[PDB]
Design a protein around this ligand. Structure first.
Ligand SMILES: O=C(O)c1cc(/N=N/c2ccc(S(=O)(=O)Nc3ccccn3)cc2)ccc1O
Ligand SMILES: O=C(O)c1cc(/N=N/c2ccc(S(=O)(=O)Nc3ccccn3)cc2)ccc1O
Ligand SMILES: O=C(O)c1cc(/N=N/c2ccc(S(=O)(=O)Nc3ccccn3)cc2)ccc1O
Length: 567
């Protein structure tokens, strides 16, 4: 009796929350009350399984049960053809209104008037926009959301208290959503082995005192935990995630010294802590990697007798002594190793063939170090917004088939690497940057997957997970792309532009830049600035003007006319 097991282990509050997240992630377009009725039904039913497991239908699988509730094209099909359909029907870019924040008094009224509904609405709106949000982490976001409203709605300045907390949590969730999106992407588009490897590299860096067999047990469980959430099995996902947090905390002395605090925290806070713990102290006495991977007379034999274990050991051994290296780098190195081993172990004398394999790594390590430095110097100069604009023009030139909204979202997100990473001491910058850029390029990948337009995005996206950043970095301007033309409807200028929020002013200014590039992909920073200058002088003119709409319309014609025959 599955439904009872999960209701018992997770408890009423969490079960009700998980089931809702599941419903809002599948039927993203269905309204809040349609999900509320569905939640009440499964919760009512689960209670009649919790009271008596001996009841009918209580013995059915969660996959079979939840599937039914939605049906009250994918609904026609039955298990296993059932769940795969609803999965394939999840939307990374769902056509939903732009969620607007009400006034603080308004927000505090609704929370006081009804707490549960207020949080069910939060869980609903998030999950429906973010179909791959790590469900257990989402309960932690709700916990904090509730906890912020309890303190700020009773305080004197309800606004200045909550708004920064709301800004901190929404930035944190957008980041959580994007990291978890990459996890699912790695599992579904690349396979269990690609995810296994990624986790082996990270947990090796984070737990360098832990033995390979111990890093293996964790990754096996973490692969289970994440496959489940990505597949939609949110109830067992949240359970197995709690079952791993318990194991880690029991066997701390075999895993890490940075765990003591996390394990004394409540169950939601505990897993959140472990998921992002600081890497432990690297072991003092660590032999050279050459001893086992280059010099050892048994390399090829170990590569033949156990390719998965030996190559797994190499990844673990490099990663456990390289926390200044991004996981994508460590995986490029591990792949390179295996690749050189494939060649050399066929040759007459393999030892001389693969003898200078660590010298074959030398470029692969330098290239990210070169990128991070370059992009951070530009960051200290430009400050962020102008840094996004630089990336904007660069990426628009490489892949101009991509929609302006996707280019503006992604280039803004790429730009955010400077503030996020150039703050750390030079040595800590590469995992931050590269491991963050993979998350942002994964977004460009998932948004493009829905409506493929650029064959270059498709190639870099599908070709590899790990080589994605060098794949885009390597792209030059598109010389085969047919420049788009300007008209009366390219740009739309109204009075409202004047009173825009700073954020929306930037986004509007960036949106025009992408289009300007889409007009002339061979355009130069100065040519683009010249047109961007005239555009600025134009809204300055009409926003100050007596009429506004007549300036915006009259001068609007002249602006697009002057922008066409001059760069
Ligand atoms: O409960 C938890 O959240 C918890 C989390 C744990 N490990 N968390 C990890 C481990 C690895 C990563 S990772 O981001 O490097 N891995 C991946 C995998 C594929 C694609 C992208 N990233 C991220 C989180 C380990 C034990 C736990 O208890
Ligand atoms: O608002 C702005 O920041 C602004 C920025 C503009 N940037 N134009 C360009 C043009 C070309 C490039 S690029 O492809 O050469 N890439 C780069 C990247 C870093 C430094 C220099 N160039 C990068 C930026 C052009 C017009 C503007 O209005
Ligand atoms: O100073 C400014 O406010 C400023 C504003 C500018 N506004 N650019 C805009 C304003 C509105 C739009 S729009 O959203 O109506 N048009 C669109 C939207 C998407 C794709 C193509 N066109 C597109 C570009 C452009 C340059 C500037 O300097």
């Amino acid at each position: 009796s599955e439904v009872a097991h999960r209701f018992k282990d997770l408890g009423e509050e969490n079960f009700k929350a998980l089931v809702l997240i599941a419903f809002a992630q599948y039927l993203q377009q269905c309204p809040f009350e349609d999900h509320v009725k569905l939640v009440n039904e499964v919760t009512e039913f689960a209670k009649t399984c919790v009271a008596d497991e001996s009841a009918e239908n209580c013995d059915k699988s969660l996959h079979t049960l939840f599937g039914d509730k939605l049906c009250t094209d994918c609904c026609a099909k039955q298990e296993p053809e059932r769940n795969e359909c609803f999965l394939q029907h999840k939307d990374d870019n769902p056509n939903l209104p732009r969620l607007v924040r009400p006034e603080v008094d308004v927000m505090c009224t609704a929370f006081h008037d009804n707490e549960e509904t207020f949080l069910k609405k939060y869980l609903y709106e998030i999950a429906r926009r973010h179909p791959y949000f790590y469900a257990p982490e989402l309960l932690f976001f709700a916990k904090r959301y509730k906890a912020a409203f309890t303190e700020c709605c009773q305080a004197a300045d309800k606004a200045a208290c909550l708004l920064p907390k709301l800004d901190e949590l929404r930035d944190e969730g957008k980041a959580s959503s994007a990291k978890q999106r990459l996890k699912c992407a790695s599992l579904q588009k690349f396979g269990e082995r690609a995810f296994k490897a990624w986790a082996v590299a990270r947990l090796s860096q984070r737990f360098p005192k832990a033995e390979f067999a111990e890093v293996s047990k964790l990754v096996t469980d973490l692969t289970k935990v994440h496959t489940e959430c990505c597949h939609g099995d949110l109830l067992e996902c949240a359970d197995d995630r709690a079952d791993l947090a318990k194991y880690i905390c029991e066997n701390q002395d075999s895993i890490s010294s940075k765990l003591k605090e996390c394990c004394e925290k409540p169950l939601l806070e505990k897993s959140h802590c472990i998921a992002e713990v600081e890497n432990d102290e690297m072991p003092a006495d660590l032999p050279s990697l050459a001893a086992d991977f280059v010099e050892s007379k048994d390399v090829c034999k170990n590569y033949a007798e156990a390719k998965d274990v030996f190559l797994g050991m190499f990844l673990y051994e490099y990663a456990r002594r390289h926390p200044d290296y991004s996981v994508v780098l460590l995986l490029r190195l591990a792949k390179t190793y295996e690749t050189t081993l494939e060649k050399c172990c066929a040759a007459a004398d393999p030892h001389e063939c693969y003898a200078k394999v660590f010298d074959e790594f030398k470029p692969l390590v330098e290239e990210p170090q070169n990128l991070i430095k370059q992009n951070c110097e530009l960051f200290e100069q430009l400050g962020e917004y102008k840094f996004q604009n630089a990336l904007l023009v660069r990426y628009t030139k490489k892949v101009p088939q991509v929609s302006t909204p996707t280019l503006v979202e992604v280039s803004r997100n790429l730009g955010k690497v400077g503030s996020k990473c150039c703050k750390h001491p030079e040595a800590k910058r590469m995992p931050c940057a590269e491991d963050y850029l993979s998350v942002v390029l994964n977004q460009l990948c998932v948004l493009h997957e829905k409506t493929p337009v650029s064959d270059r995005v498709t190639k870099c996206c599908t070709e590899s997970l790990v080589n994605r950043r060098p794949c885009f970095s390597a792209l030059e301007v598109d010389e085969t792309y047919v420049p788009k033309e300007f008209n009366a409807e390219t740009f739309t200028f109204h009075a409202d532009i004047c009173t825009l929020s700073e954020k929306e002013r930037q986004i509007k200014k960036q949106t025009a830049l992408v289009e300007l590039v889409k007009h002339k992909p061979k355009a130069t920073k100065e040519q683009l600035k010249a047109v961007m200058d005239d555009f600025a002088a134009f809204v300055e003119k009409c926003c100050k003007a007596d009429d506004k709409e007549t300036c915006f319309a009259e001068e609007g014609k002249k602006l697009v006319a002057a922008s066409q025959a001059a760069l």
